Amino acid sequence: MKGFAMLGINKLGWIEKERPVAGSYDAIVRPLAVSPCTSDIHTVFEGALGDRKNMILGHEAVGEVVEVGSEVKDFKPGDRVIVPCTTPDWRSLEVQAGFQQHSNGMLAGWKFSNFKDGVFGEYFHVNDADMNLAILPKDMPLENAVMITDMMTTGFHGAELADIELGATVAVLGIGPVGLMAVAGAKLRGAGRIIAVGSRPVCVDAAKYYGATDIVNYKDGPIESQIMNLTEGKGVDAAIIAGGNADIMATAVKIVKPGGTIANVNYFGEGEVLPVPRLEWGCGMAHKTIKGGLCPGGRLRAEMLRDMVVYNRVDLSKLVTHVYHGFDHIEEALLLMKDKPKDLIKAVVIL
Amino acid sequence: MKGFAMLGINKLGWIEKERPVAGSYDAIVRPLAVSPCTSDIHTVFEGALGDRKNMILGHEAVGEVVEVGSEVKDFKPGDRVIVPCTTPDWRSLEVQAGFQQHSNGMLAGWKFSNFKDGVFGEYFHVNDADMNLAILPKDMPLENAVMITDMMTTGFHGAELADIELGATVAVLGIGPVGLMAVAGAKLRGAGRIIAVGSRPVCVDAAKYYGATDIVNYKDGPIESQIMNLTEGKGVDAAIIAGGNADIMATAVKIVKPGGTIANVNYFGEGEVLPVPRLEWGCGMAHKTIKGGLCPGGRLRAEMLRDMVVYNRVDLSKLVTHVYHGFDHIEEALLLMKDKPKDLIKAVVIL
Amino acid sequence: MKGFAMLGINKLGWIEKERPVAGSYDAIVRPLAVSPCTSDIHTVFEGALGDRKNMILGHEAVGEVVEVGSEVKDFKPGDRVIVPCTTPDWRSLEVQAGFQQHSNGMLAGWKFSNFKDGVFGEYFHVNDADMNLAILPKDMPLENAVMITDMMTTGFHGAELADIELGATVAVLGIGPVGLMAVAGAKLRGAGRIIAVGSRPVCVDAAKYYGATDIVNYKDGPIESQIMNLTEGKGVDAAIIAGGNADIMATAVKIVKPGGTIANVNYFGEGEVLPVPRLEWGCGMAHKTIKGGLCPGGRLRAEMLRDMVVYNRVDLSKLVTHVYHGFDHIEEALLLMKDKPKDLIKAVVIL
Amino acid sequence: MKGFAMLGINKLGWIEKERPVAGSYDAIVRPLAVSPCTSDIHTVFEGALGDRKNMILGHEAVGEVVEVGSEVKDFKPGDRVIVPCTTPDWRSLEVQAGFQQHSNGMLAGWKFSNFKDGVFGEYFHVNDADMNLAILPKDMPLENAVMITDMMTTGFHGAELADIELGATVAVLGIGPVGLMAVAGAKLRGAGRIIAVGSRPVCVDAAKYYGATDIVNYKDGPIESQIMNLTEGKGVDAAIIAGGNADIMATAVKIVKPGGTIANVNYFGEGEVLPVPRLEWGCGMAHKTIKGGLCPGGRLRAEMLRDMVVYNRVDLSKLVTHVYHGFDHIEEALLLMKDKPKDLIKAVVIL
């Protein structure tokens, strides 16, 4: 079977592997549409989760079930499915503690292109199909569906972590596709003022679409001072980190008011320490809670998000700026995420 | 000073009282626009909070500050203000425990036309002005502003109490103005499917506007069975009670799935017991949490809600179906709430 | 295989059934020590969960694993195990929503002597052994261990549901073994004053041991008035319901202060409605949250509770008032729970 | 009036000031017993909250009310009172948001020897007496009472922030008096295993008394590896930081399991950045929540803690290792906190 892989740190290529086989509770799925992610660039080009050998990349797919194990009851060959990027082992003690994302170890609910061969292959394997898949609606555009699997869940998780009160003022630091979904998620948690920080015009337009009331361009000067000035020295109720380097932790702390929340969903690839500033964290005592969480997955999450899309709670179409046709364009698509052209949000390859 | 009052249970009339005087921390406010509430009908005509003598009614007003005490710093004569219907005593132990609504006793944060002369008078008194008032924006229509003071805060509080996950399915039982705001609030907590229960066409149109995906008319048959059928036997994640008689508690319990929330914001005036059904409450063990809460007030709540309106998170204009001009029309306006014409949601009297 | 069963409502007897067989993920366990529960009296003699045919009773056991399925990795034949009375299906959507106790339906995480043949048999079946068993410590008395499986988890769950702040005043309504564990659990959530309501001297002594600061005997007069008098009209922060008839709901509501919690863990068998009083529930608005929950189970819960016992956080020995030797005494033991002698808390049959 | 003061950074001395006067809502209190705090050493000798001029030190006192304002109703001259070190302005928007500790600005609920003349004076001023004082019980030893005002509330707040499940494994980093109270607080939140990190024998004995099951001495080697070894590679559910330098943040992150909580109550005086390690924080995604909070105060907190002591939930006497008699010994007492003799936990000066 063919797949586009991380040969090792800094090295991409097409490889050939054995087609995976389903256990009693698993499914084999062939991709129908896929998207590459900035996370795979951190993983390959920064070595941010350590080295790998011949790991097929990608974790954002809608697919067709081709094969299911003997104990699979709700999915069958031919079913069209939304595959959440996080596919936990539901039989784990971490699940019993309330942390599906870390079933059997830190980040280990997120398998695809963390450590498990991903979706950029002729087929891929889903553990526990009945618990980790959702049916794709008949009329749902594939490219919008693909945005559910990671961008929507992660951005929304930033808003969830932020523990927003109705009418809260929220800053979103970074308006790549995850931050855009954080903007929309903040709105769908009842945020009033939403201050989006970023400068790429395509992203700014999308941020405004999704609910941003204010846009902060770092080229006008320090972000901290800009935000403090917008809020008349009060700061924000919550800051969602959806991108940046290590220093953005310190920025987030400095703009959040006492009692507020810093909610990280950014995958940091560079810097071995994320700085928390002493004075602006109240020398340890400011009740500025710092969170940082991998997106939830599983069937329940996938269905609930899917149904938000069905009921027009968010329009995912705005994220999709590039569409390609055919398996081979996966390569070109991933390299867009590396190279970062001004007009890109997300790319989808429809096979 | 003139006001429209509860003479006692079942008896309304205009009365004359001394104009109130501000303590060091208080304001005297003259109404600019007011709305009557169904709660005052429960209070007067059902005796639902006990008898009263000569209590001026009303608790929904935007006003002009005419006089402030010596220790008031943020409001001054001439300021135009949104007055939250709940005006807590902030120096109370209940506030220290996190329950502003019950400062100095059960429901005692809600003063106006609970026990304190209300807003249907030439002037009224606000305790602790700096903590219990918000500035009215220059361009904000008075009639929309008045909807902040009770309908928005109460309906939104139903959504808050419901403890909705992103993508949850919510039922709203009753689509009077409080239920309409519960619909909008559920949407602004990220609800997917929102099932609104009610039959008055004006309310149904508003419910759909505010985010209802499904409408349930009791004239088609039992509500429980209808809802269970819509959700394919799963029930709903949360049911918000925004109206009905005592029996609606039992309905709410029967439609909520195990682990879900029944969130009441209805002011019950009739029936001395609200029934919780044994079997459908899992004989005590179904984790169906039952909440029932008075709306928050105070300056912070008022400002945060006001700012949600400024940033176009909700459009309150749809609630206002009747507008009158002049103090004397307060009487006619309140009697609309008693008589309940098919085309009424809320009435506002602009003085 | 022999077991002591519910023949049907009002009818007990010994029966013969096929010995159960383990699926790939299950274990067959033979009891080493067992206890009967008041819940089985509700189930059999009140028909509180509907009729049954030939259901082996009991859900409180420590056992020896005799057989495990091919996919079981952490338990093996010969292992001595604490079996939590609640053994969820971990692969369920309710688990994904955070409600293990209702995996695959209301109460359906609690299988043994709800609907599944229980522990009063020569052998019983545990679903998903690796996720639903805990190792019994070598030196832990069997009879103390058995108290973990239901009494400790349920009583502690009442304290968990009560959402106690450090220093809160808690009432416990009923001091049978579940209420006794609620007393201990309240103490281990940092309760200050703990007011235990009950009159059996053996239970009173145990309540005082476990942390009760005040004892209320209903024979001295109405409980509501007694509690209100003890707390100088303030009421309690939380009331845990661990026994009583339907009316105790109303008592609990009347003694809890505004903003407080009524936390039920009682299995109600009689009365089709549990009354919530209108005026004392603030006509729907008093923020008196009413909870009612089945005890958690699974391996994680079992291990965490076991380790609390290992570290001397609670002494379970006080609950065990009667010990019998041999399988046949199960019958006599269960009938004690029906007949309720003054000196009984819990009975354990050591096989 | 005489007081022992921070002349400025690095400079202590006795000074003379005007005796303060009560506003309508305030009290003037004369100390009956006082304790010095390590925080005042950070403040004076590290300049950790910036420079000061002639600020009377100390924030741990039991006193006698000598004078009250005209609007004070619950306290009067002669009353003996426990003064919480945190005395919020209850009329603030931060209080409305749920953060009394930051009323009118970051840390600004903690006034005494942060910015307001403290308790090491012939008299001191308490803002809002009715909301910020508690009656001292007649038979309560003064020196035990003084431990309520800061050590108990702060250490307990570390346990509160840790959001401990019943049976959780907790590490406490630092076993000075705050960490000792964190140990006791963890126990009173139902912790099972409690791993206390420290090496001073007097503190170790107290840690064991208060509930520590394991003691970790850094002189045996790296703390991280020791803790990971104790927990068999699982890490701890929560780590409470009650002392250390800046690096302890990174240690806390490395020992907490995914989904766990790092709960800081340490007042950091040195280092401008507290490091959060990238890999062990799951590159931003490990759901290791980092909290850091000033202790709550006010009358409600003071009464609830006082009542925990009355009901023998914790014994504070173990903290008091040194007692002096007479106002002048304040100087000697504070310098003990600077110099740190092996046998010191807390010192109390009884005037």
Ligand SMILES: C[As](C)(=O)[O-]
């Ligand atoms: C599954 As991911 C860290 O790219 O949001």
Ligand SMILES: C[As](C)(=O)[O-]
């Ligand atoms: C202040 As009201 C009970 O009418 O929402």
Ligand SMILES: C[As](C)(=O)[O-]
């Ligand atoms: C498992 As039970 C309802 O007897 O605590």
Ligand SMILES: C[As](C)(=O)[O-]
């Ligand atoms: C009031 As303090 C920071 O010394 O615990």
Ligand SMILES: [Cl-]
């Ligand atoms: Cl975990």
Ligand SMILES: [Cl-]
């Ligand atoms: Cl992104």
Ligand SMILES: [Cl-]
């Ligand atoms: Cl309260």
Ligand SMILES: [Cl-]
């Ligand atoms: Cl209404």
Ligand SMILES: [Cl-]
């Ligand atoms: Cl569920």
Ligand SMILES: [Cl-]
């Ligand atoms: Cl019991």
Ligand SMILES: [Cl-]
């Ligand atoms: Cl705040």
Ligand SMILES: [Cl-]
């Ligand atoms: Cl300390």
Ligand SMILES: [Zn+2]
């Ligand atoms: Zn991704």
Ligand SMILES: [Zn+2]
């Ligand atoms: Zn009203």
Ligand SMILES: [Zn+2]
């Ligand atoms: Zn039982």
Ligand SMILES: [Zn+2]
């Ligand atoms: Zn201190």
